[PDB]
Amino acid sequence: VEKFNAENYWKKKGLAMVPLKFPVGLGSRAAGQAAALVHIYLDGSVLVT
Amino acid sequence: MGGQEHFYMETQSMLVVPKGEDQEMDVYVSTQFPKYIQDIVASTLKLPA
Numbered sequence A: 001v002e003k004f005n006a007e008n009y010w011k012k013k014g015l016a017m018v019p020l021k022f023p024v025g026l027g028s029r030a031a032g033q034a035a036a037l038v039h040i041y042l043d044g045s046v047l048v049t
Numbered sequence B: 001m002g003g004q005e006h007f008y009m010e011t012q013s014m015l016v017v018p019k020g021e022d023q024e025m026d027v028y029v030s031t032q033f034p035k036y037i038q039d040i041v042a043s044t045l046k047l048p049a
Helices: A002-007 B034-044
Strands: A038-040 A046-048 B014-018 B025-029
Touching: B025 B034
Parallel strands: none
Antiparallel strands: A038 A046, B014 B025
């Protein structure tokens, strides 16, 4: 890219790299609370929500 | 001893509404045994319960 920028005047190239640390979490324990409901019918099939 | 008619004031009534996805079907029936309605309809449509 440095070779391109020195050879060209009206067109330039660029390069960059950034790191990432993304913390994951809510405010309290009660905010990460989840629930579900599962049924099993007599034919063997399952309904989940 | 002679027979008898139930003569419920609400005659046999039902509405059957397909959802349009995965052949989902909701039946709204005047019945006593919703599980039986679920079975005979699922068996007829060759669908899991």
